[PDB]
Structures are given as C-alpha cells and as structure tokens.
Design a protein around this ligand. Structure first.
Ligand SMILES: *[C@@H]1O[C@H](CO)[C@@H](O[C@@H]2O[C@H](CO)[C@@H](O)[C@H](O)[C@H]2NC(C)=O)[C@H](O)[C@H]1NC(C)=O
Ligand code: NA
Ligand code: NA
Lengths: 222, 202
C-alpha cells in the first residue's frame, strides 16, 4: 500500500489512512523525513471529532476528515517544500502502536512534462544464455518517471503468482528517475508470455502498467 | 525526552548476529520502549516491546539488553537472514500504553546482511539490446569485487551497475548504457584475476 502524492506548493494534499481499525478512539499522524526521526504531528479524537495538534503547529494547517465511518484522511493546507516526506496513520493495540503503509508526499513546483509515467523498454534473453544455460533473462527498463516511488513485479499471463525477480536501485536521470528489473525463467517456461507489472502514481488512468514480454519463438538459421 | 541511535549503519554476515544500540532521556517514572523495522518500501513493522518494570524482552530472533540505570535499550538480531536488511528504529513511549500517547523515535540504524564466506565463483557474461540500449548481465559471481566494461567507441550514457545477492547466495549484476554503435557493443568483466568476455559464450 506504498503510495505517493505529488502536489505543487500552495495547494492542499490528501493523505489516506491504510489501517483497518475496529473501535478506534484516537488516530495519530506521523511524519518521517529522510535523515530525521519520525515524529507525531497531531492526533484525531474519534469520539469528539477534533484534532489535537502538537505544540508549535498552526491551526487549520492539518485537518482529519472522516469521509465515512472508521475511515480517515489527513488534509494539509498551504503546502511548502518542507511538508514533503512519509506520512503514517497509527493507533495503539491489535499494547503496541501500529502504523499504516505510509504515503510519500512530494511537494514540488518543478515544471515537468505532461507524461512523467514510467516509460518501458523490453530486453529479450540472449541466444548465448538460452543455448548454454537452459534459461533466459528478461529485462524491463522503466525511464523518465516522477516521483521516484515505484513498485515492479512479475507474473505469468494467466497466473497471479508473484515470480522471483531481481531489481536495481532507482537512479536519478536529470529531473526524472529510472529503474530496471529482470527475471530469469527456465527453458520449459520460455514458451510462455510474461508480465512486468509497474505500480506508479502517474501511470495512465492511475491503474498499474502491464508490460507483456512475448514468448521465445524458434528460429531456423538458413 | 530524547532518543539517540548513535550507529548510522552496521554490517554482519548471514547466520551471525548484530546488536543495535539506543540511549534515551525521560522524566517519566514508568515507561515502555519499542523496536520497529522500516522496509525500503517505507512500511513500519513492530518487532519487540520492553517494559520499565520487566526483565529482558525476547521474541524469536529479537532480544533487548535493558539497563534502566544507564538508560540503554540495545536490540540484538540473532541468526541473521537476508530479509533482515532494513532500517531499525528505537522508540520511547510518552509514557506508553495509554491510547493518546505519542512515541519519541530515534533517527534509526541501517542493517546490511552480508552473504556468507564462500569459494570463489567465475561468472557467465551476456549482452541484451534494445536499439541504443545495451545491458550487460553478469551471473553468479563470488567475491563481489568486479569491473564491468561495455566496449564502445560512441557512448551516449552509462549507468552504475546494479549488484544484488543471488538466490544461491552469490552475486548477480546488470550494467546498462546507451551507445551509438550498440549493434557491435560487447561486454568484458574483470573478476577474481580473470577476464570474462561476452563473446566467449558466443
Ligand atoms: C524494445 O522496446 C520496446 C518497448 O517495450 C518494444 O516495443 C513494444 O513491443 C510490444 C510487444 O511485445 C508492443 O506491444 C509494444 O507496442 C511495443 N511498444 C513500443 C513503445 O513500441 C520492442 O519490441 C523492443 N524491441 C526488442 C528488439 O526487444
Ligand atoms: Na470514525
Ligand atoms: Na514541517
């Protein structure tokens, strides 16, 4: 449930609570910025429908919305660059305090292209690898995406089992990012088509991308 | 109230053990300490809790060496597994246990689990292409130390290679670039005093 929310400065942002809570009384909101300690910003009083702000914070900046029963959204007003980071909703017991999946908030005024969705490039196994090792490696390259928050995994065409893939780190390319993932499939499965599934905020229609890797087809050298 | 995690990073091999230190300052009489694991996907997972009036916490491969005098709550991760590689956070309850209470966190300590010591393994080397893009794939090598070279006389761009631990406990690597002369681009790898060419396999 690791999402990103990219917004310009001076706008409002909505951050959704990922926890499934039964009989919540207080919903706590935490901010984690890279290199800093996670800290609570406020909590929401479920019974009185009130926000309790940490000392120093301006009223109106944060607001906990309840769109429906036992469902919470943190609304931030007047965004600044320093509002960026990972936001978590939290509660006590299932006593231990438990956290949601967390949302990466990205505040930027950067003038980017209309399409900052990950752009795919497919690589098919080399003839030397399939011949010698009775396995083929498929590589999926994703480029020119923003923000850096992305998830790539692999599946067979008519199967929902997650395959054993590997991945490189996300790398910055000018104002954008790139990432690649690869899958080694045995000879016996080389005749099957494979899917590289990419989850990203800026994908077309907010639905994850399904990149099809065609099956290896036999070729006679005449 | 303050929480300090002095170590920024720590490295230990698989099956071995690592200890993560934490020091705190609190005015509260009775309190609680918690240890969390933060995944690279940013998920915050509860591991273990230690009480002010309790003995030493133990929950599977996790244990807490508690010293209320010095105010020290070191976490030990025993019999290390590769998925133990994460960022570990120490949190102080304010005081903890009550529904309105906040946690005061430390800045966290990164743990990297190293593969075990093994016989040296020479890799196989392959090249995959898509137009201008050339990927060099380096399979099953040990040790980690390697120089991967894509042989081109017209390089557009080159990225840092990605080195990962393989399911057999060795290493795999991928080096990508963009080359004008992509159709003739070949790969050479320097590893364990040997030179492996992608053309060796062709
Ligand atoms: C090089 O990369 C591109 C992009 O993934 C490949 O083109 C796609 O191929 C599939 C079929 O499997 C089509 O459905 C897509 O429409 C194509 N996308 C685009 C943007 O053209 C291409 O096949 C790859 N070439 C090689 C030699 O592997
Ligand atoms: Na509610
Ligand atoms: Na702030």
């Amino acid at each position: 449930g690791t999402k990103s929310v990219t917004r310009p400065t001076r706008s409002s942002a909505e951050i959704t609570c990922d926890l499934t809570v039964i009989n919540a009384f207080y919903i706590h909101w935490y901010l984690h910025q890279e290199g800093k300690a996670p800290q609570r910003l406020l909590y929401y009083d479920v019974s009185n429908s009130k926000d309790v702000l940490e000392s120093g914070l301006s009223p109106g900046k944060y607001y906990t919305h309840t769109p429906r029963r036992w469902s919470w959204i943190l609304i931030l007003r007047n965004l600044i660059e320093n509002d960026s980071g990972v936001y978590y909703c939290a509660t006590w017991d299932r006593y231990k305090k438990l956290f949601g999946s967390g949302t990466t908030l990205v505040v930027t005024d950067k003038q980017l292209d209309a399409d900052v969705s990950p752009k795919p490039t497919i690589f098919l196994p080399s003839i030397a690898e399939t011949k010698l090792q009775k396995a083929g490696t498929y590589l999926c390259l994703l480029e020119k995406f923003f923000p850096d928050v992305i998830k790539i995994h692999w599946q067979e065409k008519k199967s929902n089992t997650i395959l054993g893939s590997q991945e490189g780190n996300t790398m910055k390319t000018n104002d954008t990012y790139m990432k690649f993932s690869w899958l080694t499939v045995p000879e016996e499965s080389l005749d099957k088509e494979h899917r590289c599934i990419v989850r990203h905020e800026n994908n077309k229609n907010g639905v994850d991308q399904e990149i099809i890797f065609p099956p290896i087809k036999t070729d006679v050298i005449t | 109230q303050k929480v300090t995690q002095a170590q920024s990073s720590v490295s230990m091999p698989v099956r071995k053990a690592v200890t993560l230190n934490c020091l705190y300052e609190t005015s509260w009489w009775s309190y609680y300490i918690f240890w969390y694991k933060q995944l690279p996907s940013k998920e915050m997972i509860f591991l273990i809790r230690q009480g002010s009036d309790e003995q030493n916490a133990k929950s599977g491969r996790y244990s807490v060496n508690f010293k209320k005098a010095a105010k020290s709550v070191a976490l030990t991760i025993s019999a290390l597994q590769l998925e133990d590689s994460a960022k570990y956070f120490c949190a102080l309850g304010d005081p903890g246990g009550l529904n309105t209470d906040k946690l005061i966190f430390g800045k966290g300590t990164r743990v990297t689990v190293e593969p075990r010591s093994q016989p040296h393994t020479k890799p196989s080397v392959f090249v995959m292409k898509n137009g201008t893009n050339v990927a060099c794939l380096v399979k099953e090598f040990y040790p980690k130390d390697i120089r991967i070279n894509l042989v081109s006389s017209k390089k557009i761009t080159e990225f840092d290679p990605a080195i990962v631990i393989s399911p057999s406990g060795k290493y795999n690597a991928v080096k990508l670039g963009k080359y004008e002369d992509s159709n003739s681009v070949t790969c050479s790898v320097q590893h364990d005093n040997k030179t492996v060419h992608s053309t060796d396999f062709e």
